[PDB]
Amino acid sequence: EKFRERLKELVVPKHVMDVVDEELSKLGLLDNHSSEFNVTRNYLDWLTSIPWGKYSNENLDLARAQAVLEEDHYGMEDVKKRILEFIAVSQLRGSTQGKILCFYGPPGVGKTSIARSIARALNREYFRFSVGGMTDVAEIKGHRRTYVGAMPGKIIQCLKKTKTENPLILIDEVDKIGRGYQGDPSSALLELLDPEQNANFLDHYLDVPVDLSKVLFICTANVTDTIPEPLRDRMEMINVSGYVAQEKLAIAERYLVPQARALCGLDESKAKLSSDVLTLLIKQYCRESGVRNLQKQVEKVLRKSAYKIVSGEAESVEVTPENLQDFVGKPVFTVERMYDVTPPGVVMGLAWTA
Amino acid sequence: EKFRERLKELVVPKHVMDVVDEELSKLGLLDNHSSEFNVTRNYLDWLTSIPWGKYSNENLDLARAQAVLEEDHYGMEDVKKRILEFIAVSQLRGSTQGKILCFYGPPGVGKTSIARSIARALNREYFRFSVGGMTDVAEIKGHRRTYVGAMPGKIIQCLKKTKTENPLILIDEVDKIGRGYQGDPSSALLELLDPEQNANFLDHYLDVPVDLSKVLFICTANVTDTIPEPLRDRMEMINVSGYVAQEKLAIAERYLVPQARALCGLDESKAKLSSDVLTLLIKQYCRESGVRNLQKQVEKVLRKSAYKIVSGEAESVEVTPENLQDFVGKPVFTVERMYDVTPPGVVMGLAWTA
Amino acid sequence: DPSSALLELLDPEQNANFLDHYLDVPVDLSKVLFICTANVTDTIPEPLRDRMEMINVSGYVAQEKLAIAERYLVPQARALCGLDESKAKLSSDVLTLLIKQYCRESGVRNLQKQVEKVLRKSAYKIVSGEAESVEVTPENLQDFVGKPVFTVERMYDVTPPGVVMGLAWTAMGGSTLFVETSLRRPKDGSLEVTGQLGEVMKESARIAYTFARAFLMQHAPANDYLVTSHIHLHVPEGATPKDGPSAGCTIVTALLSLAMGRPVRQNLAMTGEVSLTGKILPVGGIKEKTIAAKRAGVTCIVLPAENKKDFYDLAAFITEGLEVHFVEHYREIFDIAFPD
Amino acid sequence: MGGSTLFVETSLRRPGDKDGSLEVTGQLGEVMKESARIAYTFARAFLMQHAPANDYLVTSHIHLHVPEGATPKDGPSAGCTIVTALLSLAMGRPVRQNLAMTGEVSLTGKILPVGGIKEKTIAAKRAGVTCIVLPAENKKDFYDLAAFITEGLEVHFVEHYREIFDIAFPD
Ligand SMILES: Nc1ncnc2c1ncn2[C@@H]1O[C@H](COP(=O)(O)OP(=O)(O)O)[C@@H](O)[C@H]1O
Ligand SMILES: Nc1ncnc2c1ncn2[C@@H]1O[C@H](COP(=O)(O)OP(=O)(O)O)[C@@H](O)[C@H]1O
């Protein structure tokens, strides 16, 4: 009775009901202390827990969505323009729609963080899973229902936790695929990337197909060539470039420093990081195009500041450039370029890597 | 009883009658709670899920077949001729028939798209599965009922979904079949694509053979050299080549642009793309033999036009060559060839790749 | 793997309501602390890596091993073996010799096995009546433990011309490599390189050969050694493979020492990748290279100037007796190696 | 299979400033091939100081081979026996009979320790040799063996090849 009630609100397709109806009869004829009774109970619990016909209420206003995106991140105009165009398309259609987008760029630039901001702007539910060097295809679609202690696929597990059929799905490192031999999960991604095959998605644990359309898919990478040709085909390549030194300071002053201060339990009245000391961190303690390394250095400075105030060394820590060496040590990088005055036969060039 | 009416509608062979009758008596003498019950009912369910002697009402009208094929695709005379000849032969036969066809050509040319159109023209159920990067044989054939979590082959699942014995099964990426260190899966494909052995296709899970004749098998490939000789020898090779710039304009004007407008949700009077814009897009923004990259550019132009309409910048959007850069940016391929004039020692040549 | 089953344990949302399969009622795991451990950072779960704060636990040089064994390992091993301090006595000097010659790994478990073996052998002597009290000396340690694993640390006590000490990184700690050059023959010169040198280190020899040859032109124009003579270069570890550009400056010194016939300073070890112009570039693994220098008993160590942070990121006793020299160009190294 | 003895045999391939060359045959490994080159370079240098008049190892072309042709071989343990073989051929003087030597040799001339001392020592007695030459760093390994594997063997422990030369060529 309880499981029948929990399906009342959902909009279940006909093929879902017959599977549920037939398993209910099997559950009725079983016994309480039967091992397969638990398997039937576990399987039937998953089917009802998955939302059917339930779509989260989207946000279809350009003004508020643009404002939300601007506050969360700095720059990323190429990504922001695409998201604004995504919302406008949904208004003309009159119904929610899904797209497959790709964010490729240097690591730590903001590819993963921007997608979280996208979900809140669209009022969707955020779920993240990584495919860096995948080896088992069972991650995507789970195990077969007959296997003891089997579980549904991670995508199916996403609908249970998100409790809606319109989530935002994030994929990490599509350029770091794992060429498995005993199992190749690249086929599952190609099925998911194909819009025609995306509409009808089937898993091992749940024989019934599930509609994965109208779902906004984000995949992240560093360099596009390693991505397989069938995978680059179905991805909209949105490019996320690196940051210059002055751009990093704006990100650090407005986003990195206030966030790291919050995760350390401090407020702006106790620990203060000057603008010049952040410049010294960027130009000497950082060389990557992203801000991942800079974020760790800011976190480490706040960790030492928190210890100092509690342990009685001070009551308010101010990180001047003079005493920065106490918090982080000697500069990691002291020369911006190997040659300052190139001798004859030496010419500076440019490179581009992952 | 439930399995009985499922076979009452179909026309079942004598040997299938023998297996189902002996297995039906086995269920009656079996224990409901035993693990053998799950294996027996699952296999017997698959027997009842095979549409024995069930055929879709094929479309033998040559006039409508030409209309359906022409109204969904442009050019491809070689493929269109083959389908018309297939229908003409079926009229003389008085019964349905099956063939093994292979479409090979540059990617993004219409090999998969026309396959769906052919099924609509012939009133046949459409099923697609890929063999690209495939290493395990069992997916084609299946596994014995002894093994836990053993499912039938893909072909058996095709009959259950379509509920007919004359589908249009599309096998994609036959030229990129994965080499098997433990066993080549193309060896099992030969039994699938052998006209002599199609009449009796025996798989591991389903002990009874299945008449796989009267099934239109269509295979998709990019280059015919990599396809194994035994597989290539049993198939018919039809070349679907790329289009010239003049043909690309006709495809975009009639098919790509109207389809992208429906996807974005724009009326003709709202967003317009003149032939001059499309000619520029083909010549300078897409260096390809197919119309795949052109499709992405067309979607990009219409997607940006929808944003302008919602934002109120322009009530109706008209795309012209002078303001084309506002939608797609600077041209990509600004030069038709490296040397307008060839200095001594430099000779122009021609190349042909995949 | 059941990594998903561990996600709920480390997910704050699922900690409040821990839905146990056995127990229907949830339990509160929010007020619970979790600590994790790992060994190698390549097979760690990258999807789960973001949740946990990566903390590196470095090993121990022989100084901490003596302190750890004296305070923790020996008293604990003696307690398990049932011995007493008055019966079996392990002095500080023998423990240092045991660590130096038998346990050079960065871990501690191997040191536990050796001390238990000594105590186990000592227990046999007491029970059998061989001796009322068992005492361990450096000469007796071979009988109790067994085979020394590391006997000699300096292949050359005095380096002849053409031989320069270098520093290397190994899994079992540091190692000192020598670079030897000699005349293969009594026109174009050539350099044959032997030893199990990798592609990266073989290229560095070619770069070092070019710079060393060019260095002599601006230093001693009348010296036509490296331009006309055939040189054989070898790193005297035939079996063990060697790679990395860390020996670039060592090769230049060896080539110049052979050309001028002047031996290098007898207690000098140098490290650093050299460029075509002659600029010293930073080299990793400074901690392992510098401790091996102390074991080899060298006084002055030459390092690239870009490695100043790494050298000063070490304990006081590690870099106590070393007169480190930081250089940016090889011209500084040449003066240090050839003071006259 | 309890170790075995090997021989290093060299002979002249051919009867103004052109130099000689060394060709090595036998299924030698990469490490053993490098050891031959190191030994060849040291043998040239050693003969210069010992006998400047001799010009055998500089101009003549020498072929080096290990008679177990079909058996793969590897390791630098044959460094000293290759040097002795080259010097014996150059001087035209056979080495002292019933003498077996092993040990890695650097081009400077120092003898380095080698593994498998137990197997080499057992094979030395099986061939009924009188004197065995080992690196000085292997002194502990030799005396760690059982008592019955040592008697009847006059072992010489060396750290530089110049000690092997006196032993192999007493005069
Ligand atoms: N433009 C930006 N505005 C605000 N925060 C940023 C910006 N760029 C980067 N960050 C911060 O830096 C971090 C980048 O890490 P992440 O983007 O997850 O790495 P990756 O790019 O490899 O996915 C994020 O936690 C984010 O908070
Ligand atoms: N001649 C044509 N007429 C109309 N549309 C076409 C034509 N050729 C290609 N297209 C369109 O271009 C796209 C090309 O994709 P397709 O070639 O089917 O992929 P694949 O190469 O994997 O088979 C199709 O979606 C199809 O709608």
Residue numbers in the entry:
A (entry chain E), B (entry chain D): 419 to 772
C (entry chain F): 602 to 787, 796 to 949
D (entry chain A): 773 to 787, 794 to 949
What did the article's authors report about this structure?
The hexameric, barrel-forming, AAA+ protease Lon is critical for maintaining mitochondrial matrix protein homeostasis. A human Lon monomer contains a mitochondrial targeting sequence, a Lon-associated N-terminal (LAN) domain, an α-helical neck region, an AAA+ domain, and a protease domain (PD) in a single chain. The LAN domains specifically recognize and capture fully or partially unfolded substrates, which are then threaded towards the barrel chamber for degradation using the chemical energy from ATP hydrolysis. We determined high-resolution structures of substrate-engaged, substrate-trapped, and substrate-free forms of the human mitochondrial Lon protease.
The Lon^SE^ map shows additional density in the barrel pore that we attributed to a substrate peptide ([Fig fig1]; [Fig fig2]). The substrate side chains are not resolved, probably due to averaging different substrates during single-particle reconstruction, and therefore a polyalanine sequence was modelled. The substrate is contacted by two pore loops (termed pore loop 1 and 2) in P1–P3 but is contacted only by pore loop 1 in P4 and pore loop 2 in P5. The substrate is not contacted at all by P6 (seam protomer, [Fig fig2]). The final modelled substrate is 11 residues long and adopts a twisted β-strand conformation that follows the right-handed helical arrangement of the pore loops. Taken together, the pore loops in Lon^SE^ have a right-handed staircase arrangement around the central vertical axis of the chamber. Lon^SE^ P4 and P5 are ADP-bound, while the “seam” protomer P6 is ATP-bound. For the Lon^SE^ protomers with bound ATP/ATP’ (P1–P3, P6) the AAA+-domains are located further from their respective PD in comparison to the AAA+-domains in the protomers with bound ADP. Therefore, the Lon^SE^ structure presented here represents the stage immediately following nucleotide exchange in the seam protomer P6, and prior to its re-engagement in substrate binding. Consistent with Lon^SE^ being in an active conformation, the PDs display in-plane six-fold symmetry and an open gate loop.
